[PDB]
Amino acid sequence: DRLGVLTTTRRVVEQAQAVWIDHDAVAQIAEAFAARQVTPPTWNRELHWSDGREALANYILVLDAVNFCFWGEPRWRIEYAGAVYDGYWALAASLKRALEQGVPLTDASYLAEITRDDVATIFAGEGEIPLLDERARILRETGSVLAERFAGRFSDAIAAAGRSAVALVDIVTNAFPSFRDVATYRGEQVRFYKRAQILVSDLYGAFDGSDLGAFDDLGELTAFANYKVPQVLHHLGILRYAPALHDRLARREEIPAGSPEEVEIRAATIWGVEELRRALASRGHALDAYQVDWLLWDEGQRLPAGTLPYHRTRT
Ligand SMILES: Nc1nc2c(c(CN[C@H]3C=C[C@H](O)[C@@H]3O)cn2[C@@H]2O[C@H](COP(=O)(O)O)[C@@H](O)[C@H]2O)c(=O)[nH]1
């Protein structure tokens, strides 16, 4: 466990007061999923950009640099190619739209200088993308780090990882401040690395596990601790919430980042996915943790009306 995600999150799950795993539900869900050999959907080619290897690598870094927090009222929505999108697909569509119209979002020099008005345009739609100013700041940071340390080419970073997913995550968090996703729980560091790990899985997807998307150790990735997958796990009965936390989610009350409740959700998400992975493998359906994450995130796109709302964090 070379990044320390499973180890540090396990300490949280063992001590967690507001969240816990129902291991019976894990078994039952594993039974049904294994029975019908459920598979994550293939990496989406419609709403993701495609290009030569240098531009594509840079595109994946930018996509995942700003891959966070899409909730808020009035709901942020995007119109692209005769369809309306929200959440992640709104992000994806927005970038694809910008690149098609020839915005140089894969060029480090442009990213280093990108303005608030640039990103407001790129993500123009109904409402406004949350944390707009932050996204502008992250893209400027991303650009100037690319330019300074990687000759403007994320492919330089990828090459230095030598086909290790774990090594690339560590290269990314070392160089790019925005990707440093750790917190504390009762005085101990907890390590998550959501966006850094999702980046690696997205290279694998975009490059079909060849060239720059070749990795020999993808099993070492964890789930990407977000707000949608815990909502799915709660829906499937795998995550249970204590009274005050349940009521907070129901009221759509925001939870401060790094607070005990929030850290417990994220840790239990990691271990909820890991426990489902082990239970599936037990029943002869071997998937990597990132695949179980993909599969659950996909289920999260068509949850029934009146499932408990996902938790709302911000920072
Ligand atoms: N754990 C996990 N979290 C994911 C993703 C994705 C998209 N990945 C694509 C690439 C390969 C897969 O097959 C997917 O097609 C976005 N997110 C996070 O979810 C939230 C937005 O959710 P919603 O409102 O539904 O759009 C937000 O925190 C966002 O950062 C997934 O991979 N796993």
Coordinates of C-alpha atoms and ligand atoms in Angstrom, one line a residue:
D1 CA 0.0 0.0 0.0
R2 CA 2.7 2.4 -1.3
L3 CA 0.5 5.6 -1.0
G4 CA -1.0 4.8 2.4
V5 CA -4.6 5.3 1.4
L6 CA -5.9 1.9 2.5
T7 CA -3.8 1.8 5.7
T8 CA -4.7 5.4 6.9
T9 CA -8.4 5.2 5.9
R10 CA -8.7 1.8 7.8
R11 CA -7.8 3.6 11.1
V12 CA -10.7 6.0 10.4
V13 CA -13.2 3.2 9.6
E14 CA -12.2 1.2 12.8
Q15 CA -12.9 4.4 15.0
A16 CA -15.8 6.0 13.0
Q17 CA -18.8 7.2 15.0
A18 CA -21.1 8.6 12.3
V19 CA -20.6 6.0 9.5
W20 CA -20.1 2.3 9.4
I21 CA -20.2 -0.6 6.9
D22 CA -22.9 -3.3 6.9
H23 CA -20.8 -6.3 6.0
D24 CA -24.0 -8.4 5.5
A25 CA -25.2 -6.0 2.8
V26 CA -21.7 -6.2 1.3
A27 CA -22.1 -10.0 1.0
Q28 CA -25.7 -9.8 -0.4
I29 CA -24.7 -7.1 -3.0
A30 CA -21.5 -9.2 -4.0
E31 CA -23.8 -12.2 -4.5
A32 CA -26.1 -10.4 -7.0
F33 CA -23.2 -8.5 -8.8
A34 CA -21.1 -11.7 -9.1
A35 CA -24.1 -13.7 -10.3
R36 CA -24.5 -11.4 -13.3
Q37 CA -20.8 -10.6 -13.7
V38 CA -21.3 -6.8 -13.6
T39 CA -18.7 -4.8 -15.5
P40 CA -18.0 -1.0 -15.4
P41 CA -18.9 0.7 -18.7
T42 CA -16.1 1.3 -21.2
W43 CA -14.4 4.6 -21.0
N44 CA -16.6 7.2 -22.6
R45 CA -15.5 8.3 -26.2
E46 CA -18.5 10.6 -26.9
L47 CA -17.9 13.3 -24.2
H48 CA -14.1 12.9 -23.8
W49 CA -11.7 14.7 -26.1
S50 CA -9.4 12.7 -28.4
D51 CA -6.1 13.9 -30.0
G52 CA -2.4 13.1 -30.5
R53 CA -0.6 11.6 -27.5
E54 CA 1.0 14.9 -26.2
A55 CA -2.2 16.9 -26.3
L56 CA -4.3 14.0 -25.0
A57 CA -2.0 13.5 -21.9
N58 CA -2.3 17.3 -21.2
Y59 CA -6.1 17.2 -21.7
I60 CA -6.4 14.4 -19.1
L61 CA -4.4 16.4 -16.5
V62 CA -6.6 19.4 -17.0
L63 CA -9.9 17.4 -16.9
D64 CA -9.0 15.8 -13.6
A65 CA -7.4 19.1 -12.2
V66 CA -10.9 20.6 -12.1
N67 CA -12.9 17.3 -11.5
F68 CA -14.7 18.3 -8.3
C69 CA -17.9 19.8 -6.7
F70 CA -20.7 20.3 -9.3
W71 CA -23.7 20.6 -6.9
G72 CA -25.5 23.9 -6.0
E73 CA -28.7 25.8 -6.8
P74 CA -29.5 26.9 -9.3
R75 CA -28.2 23.7 -10.8
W76 CA -25.3 24.2 -13.2
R77 CA -26.1 22.8 -16.6
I78 CA -24.4 22.8 -20.0
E79 CA -25.9 22.6 -23.6
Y80 CA -23.6 20.7 -26.0
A81 CA -24.3 19.0 -29.3
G82 CA -28.1 19.0 -28.8
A83 CA -28.1 17.7 -25.2
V84 CA -28.1 19.2 -21.7
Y85 CA -25.6 17.9 -19.1
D86 CA -24.9 18.5 -15.4
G87 CA -22.2 17.3 -13.0
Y88 CA -19.1 15.6 -14.4
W89 CA -20.6 15.2 -18.0
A90 CA -21.1 19.0 -17.9
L91 CA -17.4 19.4 -17.1
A92 CA -16.4 16.9 -19.9
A93 CA -18.8 18.4 -22.5
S94 CA -17.6 22.0 -21.5
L95 CA -13.9 21.1 -22.2
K96 CA -14.7 19.2 -25.4
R97 CA -16.8 22.2 -26.6
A98 CA -13.9 24.6 -25.8
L99 CA -11.3 22.5 -27.5
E100 CA -13.5 22.0 -30.7
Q101 CA -13.9 25.8 -31.0
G102 CA -10.1 25.8 -30.8
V103 CA -9.4 27.1 -27.2
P104 CA -5.8 25.9 -26.5
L105 CA -6.7 24.1 -23.2
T106 CA -3.8 21.6 -23.8
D107 CA -1.2 24.3 -24.1
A108 CA 0.7 25.1 -20.8
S109 CA 1.3 28.8 -21.8
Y110 CA -2.5 29.4 -22.2
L111 CA -3.3 27.5 -18.9
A112 CA -0.7 29.5 -16.9
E113 CA -2.5 32.8 -17.9
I114 CA -6.1 31.6 -18.2
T115 CA -8.5 34.3 -16.7
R116 CA -11.7 34.2 -14.7
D117 CA -13.7 35.4 -17.8
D118 CA -12.0 32.6 -20.0
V119 CA -13.3 29.9 -17.6
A120 CA -16.7 31.6 -17.1
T121 CA -17.1 31.4 -20.9
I122 CA -15.8 27.8 -21.2
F123 CA -18.4 26.7 -18.5
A124 CA -21.2 29.1 -19.6
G125 CA -24.7 27.5 -19.2
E126 CA -27.6 27.6 -16.8
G127 CA -26.4 28.9 -13.4
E128 CA -22.6 28.9 -12.9
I129 CA -20.1 26.2 -12.2
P130 CA -19.3 26.2 -8.4
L131 CA -15.9 27.5 -7.2
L132 CA -15.3 29.2 -10.6
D133 CA -12.4 31.4 -9.3
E134 CA -10.7 28.3 -7.7
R135 CA -10.9 26.4 -11.0
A136 CA -9.2 29.4 -12.7
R137 CA -6.5 29.4 -10.0
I138 CA -5.9 25.6 -10.3
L139 CA -5.6 25.8 -14.1
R140 CA -3.0 28.6 -13.8
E141 CA -1.1 26.5 -11.2
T142 CA -1.4 23.4 -13.5
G143 CA -0.1 25.3 -16.5
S144 CA 2.9 27.0 -14.8
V145 CA 4.0 23.7 -13.2
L146 CA 3.7 21.9 -16.5
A147 CA 5.8 24.6 -18.2
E148 CA 8.4 24.9 -15.4
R149 CA 9.0 21.2 -14.6
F150 CA 7.7 19.2 -17.5
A151 CA 8.7 21.3 -20.6
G152 CA 4.9 21.9 -21.1
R153 CA 4.2 18.1 -21.6
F154 CA 2.5 15.9 -19.0
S155 CA 4.0 13.0 -21.1
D156 CA 7.3 13.9 -19.4
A157 CA 5.7 13.2 -15.9
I158 CA 4.1 10.0 -17.2
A159 CA 7.4 8.7 -18.6
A160 CA 9.2 9.3 -15.3
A161 CA 6.6 7.0 -13.6
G162 CA 7.8 4.0 -15.6
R163 CA 4.4 2.3 -16.0
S164 CA 3.7 2.6 -12.2
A165 CA 0.3 4.1 -11.3
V166 CA 1.5 4.6 -7.7
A167 CA 4.7 6.3 -8.9
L168 CA 2.7 8.7 -11.1
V169 CA 0.2 9.6 -8.3
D170 CA 3.3 10.5 -6.2
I171 CA 4.9 12.5 -9.1
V172 CA 1.6 14.4 -9.5
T173 CA 1.1 15.3 -5.8
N174 CA 4.8 16.3 -5.4
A175 CA 4.6 18.8 -8.3
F176 CA 0.9 20.0 -8.4
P177 CA -0.3 21.5 -5.1
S178 CA -4.0 21.2 -6.0
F179 CA -3.7 17.4 -6.1
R180 CA -2.5 17.1 -2.4
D181 CA -5.6 15.4 -0.9
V182 CA -4.9 14.5 2.7
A183 CA -6.7 15.3 6.0
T184 CA -6.5 14.5 9.7
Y185 CA -8.7 12.3 11.9
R186 CA -8.3 12.4 15.7
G187 CA -4.7 13.8 15.2
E188 CA -3.6 11.2 12.5
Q189 CA -3.0 11.9 8.8
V190 CA -5.5 10.3 6.5
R191 CA -4.5 10.0 2.8
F192 CA -7.1 10.0 0.0
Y193 CA -5.6 11.3 -3.3
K194 CA -8.9 11.2 -5.1
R195 CA -8.1 13.4 -8.2
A196 CA -4.5 12.1 -8.5
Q197 CA -5.8 8.5 -8.6
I198 CA -8.7 9.2 -11.0
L199 CA -6.2 10.9 -13.3
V200 CA -4.2 7.6 -13.6
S201 CA -7.4 5.6 -14.3
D202 CA -8.4 8.2 -17.0
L203 CA -5.0 7.8 -18.8
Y204 CA -5.5 4.1 -18.8
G205 CA -9.0 4.7 -20.2
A206 CA -8.0 7.3 -22.8
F207 CA -5.0 5.4 -24.1
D208 CA -6.6 1.8 -23.9
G209 CA -3.8 0.7 -21.5
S210 CA -1.1 1.3 -24.1
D211 CA 1.7 3.9 -24.6
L212 CA 1.1 6.7 -22.0
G213 CA -1.8 4.8 -20.5
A214 CA 0.2 1.6 -19.9
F215 CA 0.3 0.7 -16.1
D216 CA 1.4 -2.6 -14.6
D217 CA 0.0 -2.0 -11.1
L218 CA -3.6 -0.6 -11.5
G219 CA -4.8 -3.0 -8.7
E220 CA -2.9 -0.6 -6.3
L221 CA -5.4 2.3 -6.9
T222 CA -8.3 2.7 -4.4
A223 CA -11.7 4.1 -5.0
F224 CA -11.9 7.9 -5.6
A225 CA -13.5 9.3 -2.4
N226 CA -16.2 11.6 -3.8
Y227 CA -19.9 12.4 -3.0
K228 CA -21.6 10.1 -5.5
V229 CA -20.2 6.7 -4.7
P230 CA -21.0 6.9 -0.9
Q231 CA -24.6 7.8 -2.0
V232 CA -24.7 4.6 -4.1
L233 CA -23.2 2.6 -1.3
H234 CA -25.8 4.0 1.1
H235 CA -28.5 3.2 -1.4
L236 CA -27.2 -0.4 -1.7
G237 CA -27.3 -0.6 2.2
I238 CA -23.4 -1.0 2.4
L239 CA -22.9 2.4 4.2
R240 CA -25.0 3.2 7.2
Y241 CA -25.2 6.7 8.7
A242 CA -25.8 7.7 12.4
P243 CA -28.8 9.9 13.3
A244 CA -27.3 13.5 13.2
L245 CA -25.3 12.8 10.0
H246 CA -28.3 11.1 8.2
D247 CA -30.5 14.2 9.1
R248 CA -27.8 16.6 7.8
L249 CA -27.6 14.8 4.4
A250 CA -31.5 14.8 4.3
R251 CA -31.6 18.6 4.9
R252 CA -28.8 19.1 2.3
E253 CA -26.8 20.9 5.1
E254 CA -23.2 21.5 4.0
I255 CA -20.4 19.6 5.9
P256 CA -17.0 21.4 6.4
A257 CA -14.1 19.7 4.6
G258 CA -11.8 17.8 6.9
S259 CA -14.4 17.6 9.7
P260 CA -14.7 14.2 11.4
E261 CA -18.1 13.3 9.7
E262 CA -16.7 14.2 6.2
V263 CA -13.5 12.3 6.7
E264 CA -15.5 9.3 8.0
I265 CA -17.6 9.3 4.8
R266 CA -14.6 9.4 2.5
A267 CA -12.7 6.7 4.5
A268 CA -15.8 4.4 4.5
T269 CA -16.2 5.0 0.8
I270 CA -12.7 3.6 0.2
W271 CA -13.3 0.6 2.5
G272 CA -16.9 0.1 1.3
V273 CA -15.4 -0.3 -2.3
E274 CA -12.5 -2.5 -1.0
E275 CA -14.8 -4.8 1.0
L276 CA -17.1 -5.2 -2.1
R277 CA -14.0 -5.9 -4.2
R278 CA -12.9 -8.7 -1.8
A279 CA -16.5 -10.1 -1.6
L280 CA -16.8 -10.2 -5.4
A281 CA -13.4 -11.9 -5.8
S282 CA -14.4 -14.4 -3.2
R283 CA -17.4 -15.3 -5.4
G284 CA -15.1 -15.7 -8.5
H285 CA -15.6 -12.2 -10.0
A286 CA -12.2 -10.5 -9.9
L287 CA -12.2 -6.7 -10.5
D288 CA -9.7 -4.0 -9.5
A289 CA -10.9 -1.5 -6.9
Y290 CA -10.9 1.3 -9.5
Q291 CA -13.3 -0.9 -11.7
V292 CA -15.6 -1.4 -8.7
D293 CA -15.5 2.4 -8.2
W294 CA -16.4 3.0 -11.9
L295 CA -19.2 0.5 -11.7
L296 CA -20.7 2.2 -8.6
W297 CA -20.3 5.7 -10.1
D298 CA -22.2 4.5 -13.2
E299 CA -25.0 3.2 -10.9
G300 CA -25.0 6.7 -9.3
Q301 CA -26.2 8.2 -12.6
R302 CA -29.7 6.6 -12.3
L303 CA -30.5 6.3 -8.6
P304 CA -34.3 6.3 -7.8
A305 CA -36.1 9.4 -6.7
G306 CA -36.0 10.0 -3.0
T307 CA -32.7 8.2 -2.2
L308 CA -30.9 10.1 0.5
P309 CA -29.1 13.2 -1.0
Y310 CA -25.4 13.0 -1.4
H311 CA -23.3 14.9 1.1
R312 CA -22.3 18.5 0.3
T313 CA -18.7 19.6 1.3
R314 CA -17.3 22.4 -0.8
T315 CA -13.6 23.2 0.2
Ligands
LIG1 N1 -15.5 7.8 -7.5 C1 -15.6 8.4 -8.8 N2 -15.9 9.7 -8.8 C2 -16.1 10.3 -10.0 C3 -15.9 9.6 -11.2 C4 -16.2 10.6 -12.3 C5 -16.2 10.4 -13.8 N3 -15.2 9.4 -14.3 C6 -15.4 8.8 -15.6 C7 -14.2 8.0 -16.1 C8 -14.4 6.7 -16.1 C9 -15.7 6.3 -15.5 O1 -16.3 5.2 -16.3 C10 -16.5 7.6 -15.6 O2 -17.2 7.7 -16.8 C11 -16.4 11.8 -11.6 N4 -16.3 11.6 -10.3 C12 -16.6 12.5 -9.2 O3 -18.0 12.3 -9.0 C13 -18.7 13.5 -8.6 C14 -19.7 14.0 -9.7 O4 -20.7 13.1 -9.9 P1 -22.0 13.4 -10.9 O5 -22.9 14.3 -10.2 O6 -22.6 12.0 -11.0 O7 -21.5 13.9 -12.2 C15 -17.6 14.5 -8.4 O8 -17.1 14.3 -7.0 C16 -16.5 14.0 -9.4 O9 -15.2 14.5 -9.1 C17 -15.7 8.2 -11.2 O10 -14.9 7.6 -12.2 N5 -15.5 7.6 -9.9

